[PDB]
Motif scaffolding. Structure first.
Motif, PDB file in Angstrom:
ATOM      1  N   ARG A  52       8.451  -0.582   3.826  1.00 37.18           N
ATOM      2  CA  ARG A  52       8.342  -0.640   5.276  1.00 37.18           C
ATOM      3  C   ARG A  52       7.304  -1.679   5.677  1.00 37.18           C
ATOM      4  O   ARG A  52       6.193  -1.631   5.157  1.00 37.18           O
ATOM      5  CB  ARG A  52       7.767   0.662   5.788  1.00 37.18           C
ATOM      6  N   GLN A  53       7.693  -2.583   6.522  1.00 36.34           N
ATOM      7  CA  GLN A  53       6.810  -3.640   6.967  1.00 36.34           C
ATOM      8  C   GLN A  53       6.131  -3.252   8.302  1.00 36.34           C
ATOM      9  O   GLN A  53       6.833  -3.095   9.307  1.00 36.34           O
ATOM     10  CB  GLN A  53       7.583  -4.962   7.105  1.00 36.34           C
ATOM     11  N   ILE A 104       0.874  -1.189   0.000  1.00 35.95           N
ATOM     12  CA  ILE A 104       0.000   0.000   0.000  1.00 35.95           C
ATOM     13  C   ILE A 104       0.878   1.194   0.000  1.00 35.95           C
ATOM     14  O   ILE A 104       1.868   1.317   0.670  1.00 35.95           O
ATOM     15  CB  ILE A 104      -1.035  -0.075   1.141  1.00 35.95           C
ATOM     16  N   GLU A 105       0.462   2.160  -0.806  1.00 37.24           N
ATOM     17  CA  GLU A 105       1.258   3.415  -0.631  1.00 37.24           C
ATOM     18  C   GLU A 105       0.589   4.253   0.414  1.00 37.24           C
ATOM     19  O   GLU A 105      -0.304   5.059   0.028  1.00 37.24           O
ATOM     20  CB  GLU A 105       1.428   3.994  -2.019  1.00 37.24           C
ATOM     21  N   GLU A 106       0.978   4.084   1.691  1.00 42.21           N
ATOM     22  CA  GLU A 106       0.525   4.995   2.753  1.00 42.21           C
ATOM     23  C   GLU A 106       1.740   5.330   3.622  1.00 42.21           C
ATOM     24  O   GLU A 106       2.073   4.681   4.633  1.00 42.21           O
ATOM     25  CB  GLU A 106      -0.601   4.510   3.646  1.00 42.21           C
ATOM     26  N   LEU A 107       2.412   6.356   3.156  1.00 45.01           N
ATOM     27  CA  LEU A 107       3.683   6.712   3.848  1.00 45.01           C
ATOM     28  C   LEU A 107       3.457   7.383   5.191  1.00 45.01           C
ATOM     29  O   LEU A 107       4.547   7.680   5.768  1.00 45.01           O
ATOM     30  CB  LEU A 107       4.591   7.659   3.079  1.00 45.01           C
ATOM     31  N   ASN A 108       2.230   7.668   5.690  1.00 42.20           N
ATOM     32  CA  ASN A 108       2.287   8.385   6.981  1.00 42.20           C
ATOM     33  C   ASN A 108       1.529   7.602   8.056  1.00 42.20           C
ATOM     34  O   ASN A 108       0.933   8.194   8.905  1.00 42.20           O
ATOM     35  CB  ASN A 108       1.838   9.800   6.640  1.00 42.20           C
ATOM     36  N   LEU A 109       1.558   6.247   8.101  1.00 41.75           N
ATOM     37  CA  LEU A 109       1.021   5.566   9.283  1.00 41.75           C
ATOM     38  C   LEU A 109       1.874   5.779  10.517  1.00 41.75           C
ATOM     39  O   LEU A 109       3.112   5.900  10.421  1.00 41.75           O
ATOM     40  CB  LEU A 109       0.942   4.033   9.137  1.00 41.75           C
ATOM     41  N   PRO A 110       1.280   5.810  11.707  1.00 39.12           N
ATOM     42  CA  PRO A 110       2.068   5.688  12.925  1.00 39.12           C
ATOM     43  C   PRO A 110       2.376   4.183  13.037  1.00 39.12           C
ATOM     44  O   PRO A 110       1.884   3.255  12.317  1.00 39.12           O
ATOM     45  CB  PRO A 110       1.098   6.258  13.966  1.00 39.12           C
ATOM     46  N   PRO A 117      12.449  -2.448   7.779  1.00 38.92           N
ATOM     47  CA  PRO A 117      12.702  -2.467   6.332  1.00 38.92           C
ATOM     48  C   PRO A 117      12.636  -3.892   5.779  1.00 38.92           C
ATOM     49  O   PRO A 117      13.024  -4.908   6.407  1.00 38.92           O
ATOM     50  CB  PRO A 117      14.124  -1.916   6.204  1.00 38.92           C
ATOM     51  N   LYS A 118      12.200  -3.958   4.540  1.00 42.78           N
ATOM     52  CA  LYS A 118      12.047  -5.190   3.783  1.00 42.78           C
ATOM     53  C   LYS A 118      12.298  -4.840   2.322  1.00 42.78           C
ATOM     54  O   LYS A 118      12.139  -3.673   1.943  1.00 42.78           O
ATOM     55  CB  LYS A 118      10.642  -5.739   3.997  1.00 42.78           C
ATOM     56  N   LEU A 119      12.655  -5.858   1.524  1.00 44.85           N
ATOM     57  CA  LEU A 119      12.670  -5.697   0.079  1.00 44.85           C
ATOM     58  C   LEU A 119      11.666  -6.674  -0.517  1.00 44.85           C
ATOM     59  O   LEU A 119      11.620  -7.846  -0.067  1.00 44.85           O
ATOM     60  CB  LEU A 119      14.063  -5.964  -0.486  1.00 44.85           C
ATOM     61  N   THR A 134      -0.035  -8.141   7.994  1.00 44.29           N
ATOM     62  CA  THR A 134       1.131  -7.354   7.599  1.00 44.29           C
ATOM     63  C   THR A 134       0.832  -6.535   6.366  1.00 44.29           C
ATOM     64  O   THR A 134       0.255  -7.064   5.389  1.00 44.29           O
ATOM     65  CB  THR A 134       2.298  -8.311   7.330  1.00 44.29           C
ATOM     66  N   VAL A 135       1.210  -5.272   6.408  1.00 42.88           N
ATOM     67  CA  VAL A 135       1.068  -4.351   5.314  1.00 42.88           C
ATOM     68  C   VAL A 135       2.467  -3.768   5.029  1.00 42.88           C
ATOM     69  O   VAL A 135       3.150  -3.325   5.909  1.00 42.88           O
ATOM     70  CB  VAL A 135       0.032  -3.234   5.623  1.00 42.88           C
ATOM     71  N   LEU A 136       2.812  -3.831   3.744  1.00 44.90           N
ATOM     72  CA  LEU A 136       4.087  -3.273   3.286  1.00 44.90           C
ATOM     73  C   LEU A 136       3.760  -1.935   2.632  1.00 44.90           C
ATOM     74  O   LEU A 136       2.864  -1.824   1.821  1.00 44.90           O
ATOM     75  CB  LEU A 136       4.749  -4.214   2.274  1.00 44.90           C
TER      76      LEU A 136
END
Lengths: 99, 6, 99
Positions: free
Chosen positions: A57-58, A33-39, A44-46, A74-76
């Motif tokens: 980001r995992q 998911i593109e959600e760069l501002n979760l708390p 890190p993961k690839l 899990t959401v990446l």
């Protein structure tokens, strides 16, 4: 419900309280998911696919509601044109392929 | 064409 | 058949007279198989996924038998990490997502 495949199978999901559009993806091991501002804490993961790998980001134990069906897992998070619901959450909502 | 995660 | 999603939904296909394994992939617009020759004409194409874009060969009107079900359509050939059957052929065999 039944989702045909004439167009991309985009549905409404809820994550971090917010409604978003995502693809139900049987070809995805993981949910991206593109959600760069979760708390929350992440690690890190690839992950890889058709062009190679990207950094993500995992986040673990994130609630994700898919068409009214609740899931948690899990959401990446990383750059993607298309939010992707992968098999880790599709299994929780009892999704199957049929033909 | 967009084509999906391993 | 009815396929659950605890594991990757890999099936056997027939293409160009050969047996291959491929992933039934609702998140793919197109069908992408690892490098091989197929009969007839092809033209260059580029396609994208996570990781970016790749160059492929586009073959049109290729018969593919997917777990016993016939399709005839475009097959892209290139450096994909896994063989995938995308929506262009999943629609032909009548595949849906259900939950």
């Amino acid at each position: 419900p039944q989702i045909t495949l004439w167009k991309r199978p985009l549905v409404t999901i809820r994550i971090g309280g917010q409604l978003k559009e995502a693809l139900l993806d049987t070809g995805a091991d993981d949910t991206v998911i593109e959600e760069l501002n979760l708390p929350g804490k992440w690690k890190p993961k690839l992950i890889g696919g058709i062009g190679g790998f990207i950094k993500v980001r995992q986040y673990d134990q994130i609630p994700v509601e898919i068409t009214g069906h609740k899931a948690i897992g899990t959401v990446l998070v990383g750059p993607t044109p298309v939010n992707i619901i992968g098999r880790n959450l599709l299994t929780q909502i009892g999704c199957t392929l049929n033909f | 064409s967009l084509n999906x995660i391993x």
